[PDB]
Every structure is written in structure tokens, then in C-alpha cells.
Enzyme design. Structure first.
Site, PDB file in Angstrom:
ATOM      1  N   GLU A  11       0.775  -1.214   0.000  1.00 15.51           N
ATOM      2  CA  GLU A  11       0.000   0.000   0.000  1.00 15.51           C
ATOM      3  C   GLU A  11       0.807   1.264   0.000  1.00 15.51           C
ATOM      4  O   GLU A  11       0.308   2.329  -0.335  1.00 15.51           O
ATOM      5  CB  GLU A  11      -0.885   0.047   1.262  1.00 15.51           C
ATOM      6  CG  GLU A  11      -1.900  -1.066   1.232  1.00 15.51           C
ATOM      7  CD  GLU A  11      -2.982  -0.838   0.230  1.00 15.51           C
ATOM      8  OE1 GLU A  11      -3.135   0.171  -0.434  1.00 15.51           O
ATOM      9  OE2 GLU A  11      -3.779  -1.828   0.178  1.00 15.51           O
ATOM     10  N   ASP A  20      -6.516   6.800  -4.652  1.00 10.56           N
ATOM     11  CA  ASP A  20      -6.032   5.442  -4.843  1.00 10.56           C
ATOM     12  C   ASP A  20      -6.157   5.053  -6.315  1.00 10.56           C
ATOM     13  O   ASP A  20      -6.582   5.878  -7.132  1.00 10.56           O
ATOM     14  CB  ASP A  20      -6.704   4.423  -3.934  1.00 10.56           C
ATOM     15  CG  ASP A  20      -8.114   4.169  -4.356  1.00 10.56           C
ATOM     16  OD1 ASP A  20      -8.668   4.703  -5.287  1.00 10.56           O
ATOM     17  OD2 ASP A  20      -8.729   3.335  -3.591  1.00 10.56           O
TER      18      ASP A  20
END
EC number: 3.2.1.17
Length: 162
Positions: A11, A20
Site C-alpha cells: 500500500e 487510490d
């Protein structure tokens, strides 16, 4: 290697609000704030999550705290899920961490949707599951990450992350 280190690799860490891969507002270690296109809505959710007026920026400590809560919740979601729990219980330690990774990314509902693959994992049919998991939008949208997760399910070792 362990769940925290593995997800930290997949991540990354960002201290300022960002978008994202799907274009949603996120912060820290993959902590989704909102699916709303509104930055203001994201700032609001962030303030509420952290407990202070952040200005869209947080500290490392704060990012880490959200991360711990997020991992905890993921595990807790698995254990409470009727389709997930049995799979998780049947797996070895390495593979259990892979399943948590997937839930952290897609959520409980998303993962529980992989019916055939879950069944294959449960039966310990590594290679067959890997092929089936690859036939998914998930693999096609984030292939590098998906390949790391899938290979770890195939091998049962952390080689893909080392």
C-alpha cells in the site's frame, strides 16, 4: 515478514490525502476515506477518523494508528464472516496473512465473492486456485500486487515479497 510489513509494501505510506488506483480519497497506509468525489467530504472524514482538525495532513504516528485499526478490523471481519472464517481456519500462517491482505484491499464482501477460489484454497489446490484468482477484475486492475498475492498462495512462502 508479517502482515504489517506485507501490506506496508503493497500500500505504501502517504501523509497527505491522495487518490487510490480507483480514484478514491485515501490517506496513510491504504486507509480509504470516502468514495465521494468531494475533497471536502474526504477532509471531513479524515478529521473524524483522527479526532482533530487536520488540514488533510497527518503524522506518521497517526497513519500507523489508523493502520493498526484497519488490520484489526480486517481480521475481525474475516472471523465474523461465514464464508471466510472456514477458509481462514484451514490455512497455514503465511496463507492466512494473504487472505487478510485481500480483505484489507477489497473488503469482506468482495473477497467472499470469490466462491470457487475460496473452495479451492480450502481444498489446498494451490495451482488451481491461483489460475482461478487471476480471472478477475482485481488481477486485471492491479496485476503486480495480485501477482504477489497469488504467488504467495501458490507457494506458501514470502519469496514474492523478499
Amino acid at each position: 515478514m508479517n502482515i504489517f510489513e506485507m501490506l506496508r509494501i503493497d500500500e505504501g505510506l502517504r501523509l497527505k490525502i491522495y487518490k487510490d488506483t480507483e480514484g478514491y480519497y485515501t490517506i496513510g497506509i491504504g486507509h480509504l476515506l470516502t468514495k465521494s468525489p468531494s475533497l471536502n467530504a474526504a477532509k471531513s472524514e479524515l478529521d473524524k477518523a483522527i479526532g482533530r482538525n487536520t488540514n488533510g495532513v497527518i503524522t506518521k504516528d497517526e497513519a500507523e494508528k489508523l493502520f493498526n485499526q484497519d488490520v484489526d478490523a480486517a481480521v475481525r471481519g474475516i472471523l465474523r464472516n461465514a464464508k471466510l472464517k472456514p477458509v481462514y481456519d484451514s490455512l497455514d500462517a503465511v496463507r492466512r496473512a494473504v487472505l487478510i491482505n485481500m480483505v484489507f484491499q477489497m473488503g469482506e464482501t468482495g473477497v467472499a465473492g470469490f466462491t470457487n477460489s475460496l473452495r479451492m484454497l480450502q481444498q489446498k489446490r494451490w495451482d488451481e486456485a491461483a489460475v482461478n484468482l487471476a480471472k478477475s477484475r482485481w488481477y486485471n486492475q492491479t496485476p503486480n500486487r495480485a501477482k504477489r498475492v497469488i504467488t504467495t498462495f501458490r507457494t506458501g512462502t514470502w519469496d514474492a515479497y523478499k
